[PDB]
Nucleic acid binder design. Structure first.
Lengths: 95, 269, 262, 93, 265, 253
DNA sequence: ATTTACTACTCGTTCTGGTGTTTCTCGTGTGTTCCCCGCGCCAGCGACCGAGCGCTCGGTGCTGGCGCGGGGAACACTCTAATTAGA
DNA sequence: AAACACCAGAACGAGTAGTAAATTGGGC
């Protein structure tokens, strides 16, 4: 079991509640939990199946040098860029 | 946008949650506890094995449906958290395991084998030979009293006798502690698809088997720890006891060791 | 007997179960002559009421409209040791199992089962009769039938209505087995699944009322067949009081073992 | 140990200081994996640079829930202690 | 508010920045591209930042980088090191005086050299041998490792060429090892110019430490990349390097090892 | 020698250094006659510039305004091995260390140190002399002196910090180690504290006592600007390198 | 030339208060075999003290990580009636 | 009576040109 953090924006309330079923809603769209790999994958299934037009980002603790791994669904002004395997995030301007 | 909501394993779940003095509603698919003032407390019903409801709660239909689908046992408790009522998934029982448990319960010889297995797994020593269920229950009562006197002397608690009817604090703590152990224990059995009423040493009661399983380990960790709380005599014992039990249920990983143990007991068949 | 409560809040004001409506209609309920309480959607139960029902031993179960579906019931896994051990003792013995199977055949078709027939043989006969009944209803309602082809992934309209109706009947059947005090997982024709006995009883009263109605709805071919099938099943289970009659049927089927069920 | 910090209405100073060590995935949402003392440093930066905003910090532990969180400031979502089990409760208007 | 650095063992290896200007926004290391996209970079959690050609650092950026103990390295083609800037006064007096004491005495310097030979080849150096003889034997064993690895991974080998694909990979790989290596020394508070086997060069000591472990994991892995002969080798090398620097926990084992060598005499 | 660059961009146009100003004033700089380029806040360096400055072995040192503070420096930890081993050889031996301490005493007070005195005794004498200078300046400028918890002591701390700045700039420009001190030991800036303590009360401290006498609203800014003006006009940084070379030269190479 | 403190101002999201509208996310012939997460057992880290003339210098057991093992989809099978549909 | 879908209005915070002011967060 590892740590899981889910951040949502413009998601229908179905997904927000579904995430409230297993995670604690610390902030508006910021949910925290600690689940196994299977439960993580399930949460991700619900995220990709229930989210529409919204953007969600999921980040879990692993044993990489960074110490965590993340993946995203949807489009946002902050997009991840691969710098020689190291995943960072760039902020794009308007247009 | 309708995906099957499946429950999560019992060992990978939080112990217990207590709610009081507020209505339980389903908001956008989520277990919500609203207070008289209107403050919404989102509860992670999926990642908790058992939710214990204190007096003052008003549960809704969709709330019990939701708690049922995620495999979360709802336990209405009363004074000192003693279980008054319970609700759960009615079809969440395994045919093979029910028929196995009941097959071991019907025959008197297999029933005696299961009782002996419970005695040995509890005290670490085999039961006396050629002894009936009532005699093993009497010896069990004597050993229980000796454990109450031994814990009373170890932790220094003024002891005068075991009193179930609330009509001191120590007993209350025990009743709380053991109560919690009963609660989670029942959930395990439900998660294991057995029946809670089909007992071997205890009979007739709707949770007899539960009382058996808990009685294997109650004095191993739960009862002495309860004594600890009594040693301090706090102002809000119950809550603290609850916390302590939770920590014990973590430190011993009880939720993970119950199902094998139960199986081990039935392995005496 | 049994009571249904809907669209109101359960409480205890002067020592009796009260059900409050949106219009202010109190429905007191004596603790007696109620073996089980049926909670329909829209019901908020207080703690005092659950405590009072718990003291008397009244079974509570959360169900849908007219018990179309069952969600949660008090005392999970069974509250009676005698009835559980009774049904189990009947299912473990092959002879008693054959007796209960024969009783199910006779109550199903209205004629005794052929002599010197095993469980599997009666399952085959039952199957051929089931196919013949599907074809017969197809001729009576004039529906093009090609077979029960169900895909638990995509989710044909006739198999859709049939599926929904069988689901409702599984609902009322499980509700009845719970109200009677037996285990829905311990079956005789069906085994292994967690609702085998539910599938047995449902198979007994399947083609009596619900499936012909399903063929009627498929004949009308509505836009939302699921809703019309569930609501029609609600009407049949209500006006026909099928759930009330199911308990004597179940206790009789299990009574066919002759071990004196308590 | 994984560390996540969420901030609202903080001066850009604290946002940049959090950008010194953590990856800003969303506006005010910072992710990282640090040790205990480094977490202490980040919390010191938080309590030092936050003055009118509300900040919630949650890190991985070996507790039963798996993580632990603490809050600085006043927000509509306030953590409540439920027999030691700290959850969150959404205040009304 | 103060801002103290963190242990290097708990940091990320390296980041490569190309075609952008490096600024500081609200107190944060930022990399702005030509298109306007802003890339935040955690300067404190990085042990070494590689600055590829096309980068224009700002003053505040080197201030921040130097305050968090993050070495900046201006690199050139294939990752070769060109220049570097780091914390100027972040060195320990006792450690510097210890290393310099070991370096001034010729006998102690010979002891440290023999310690590097023993820790490098796993066998004690021959007795009564000067620094130059151990240097020739070291070069011979180096070529032997080049031929042995070239045979193990099936790479066409013609010689070690330093003036401008396999060699390139080597130059990149070792280059990376140099970078973090230097940073490690800075995190320990020693001087990179005070070398024992190599002398005169401003990073001599660095090279020495690198020459202890370069053929253990860095060179062979580089050969593997050559075995594939990819279109973009550098990136694949860089990435791969980071993985090694994770799998071996190099940053955790560099400081003791260095100290271990200084334990000689 | 050295040069200060401020408020502009550093590029390489056709083989030489160039500094572009905000108004458009090209400041070309030839690759020679500069051993250390000092960059003040307001400077952006291109990659080719660092490549050219690295090829010819030009030290780059990012420092504050007029070198008031030292922030970073190229070739970390020292660029010349000979000078580092020289300062270290002078500081390791107690006799050479005592000689360098006596040279610092002589250049500090203007008189040779008393004979047969250890480093500790010279440190006590130097401390008492520091007290006498504190009381003397406090009487000259009329400042209430009593002897800090982590406005007069504020100005003193600020001035001493700036001087630690220019001194560290000189030690890095010369190529030596700031942590290898003679009077102070163990600290990462011990040598900075020595060389700075040689010329501390020479000029900088009386200005801090003057600002403390005026008692301004923002003392830190006025003290820092005053120190930048003293380091600029008096060319203290240019005068520091020969002083350090003499102090370390007293060890007979 | 760079960066930040402070200020309107745009833009987007969340939240809430109104209507309706529904009581809904289900189909089950019963039982044997290869594949992989999960616990499980054994190795590594997280203030009094000298030198001068009170002052001044200040120095010196869990834990994650490789391994046996025990729990799921093809298919492998009665049994009957007009060789395949049904249980 | 409980709960969700859908839509318009209020409240609130992030992002962004503008202005102005600084070249700064000690000491040993």
């Amino acid at each position: 079991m590892s740590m899981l953090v889910v951040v949502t924006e413009n998601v229908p309330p179905r997904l927000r509640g579904r995430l409230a079923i297993w995670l604690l809603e610390v902030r508006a769209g910021v949910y925290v939990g600690d689940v196994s790999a299977k439960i993580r994958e399930m949460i991700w299934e619900q995220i990709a199946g229930l989210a529409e037009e919204g953007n969600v980002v999921m980040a879990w603790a692993t044993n990489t040098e960074t110490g965590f791994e993340f993946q995203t669904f949807g489009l946002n002004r902050r997009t991840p860029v691969d710098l020689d395997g190291l995943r960072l995030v760039s902020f794009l301007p308007v247009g | 946008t309708w995906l099957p909501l499946n429950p999560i394993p019992l060992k990978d779940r939080v112990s217990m949650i207590f709610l009081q003095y507020g209505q339980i509603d389903v908001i956008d698919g989520a277990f919500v506890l609203i207070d008289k003032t209107g403050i919404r407390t989102h509860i992670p019903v999926g990642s908790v094995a058992c939710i214990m409801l204190e007096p003052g709660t008003r549960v809704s239909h969709a709330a019990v449906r939701l708690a049922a689908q995620v495999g979360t046992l709802l336990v209405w408790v009363g004074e000192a958290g003693v279980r008054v009522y319970a609700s759960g998934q009615p079809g969440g029982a395994r045919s093979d395991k029910l028929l196995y448990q009941a097959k071991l319960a019907l025959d008197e010889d297999l029933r005696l084998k299961v009782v002996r297995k419970m005695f040995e797994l509890r005290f670490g020593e085999p039961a006396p030979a050629r002894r009936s269920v009532e005699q093993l229950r009497g010896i069990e009562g004597s050993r229980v009293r000796a454990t109450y006197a031994l814990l009373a002397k170890q932790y220094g608690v003024t002891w005068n006798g075991r009193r179930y009817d609330p009509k001191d604090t120590i007993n209350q703590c025990i009743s709380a502690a053991t109560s919690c152990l009963y609660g989670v224990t029942e959930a395990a059995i439900l998660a294991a698809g057995y029946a809670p009423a089909i007992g071997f040493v205890h009979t007739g009661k709707p949770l007899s088997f539960v009382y058996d399983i808990a009685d294997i380990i109650k004095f191993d960790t739960v009862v002495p720890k309860a004594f600890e709380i009594a040693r301090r005599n706090p102002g809000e014992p119950d809550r603290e006891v609850r916390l302590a039990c939770r920590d014990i249920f973590r430190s011993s990983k009880t939720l993970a060791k119950l199902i094998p143990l139960i199986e081990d007991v039935l392995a005496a068949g």
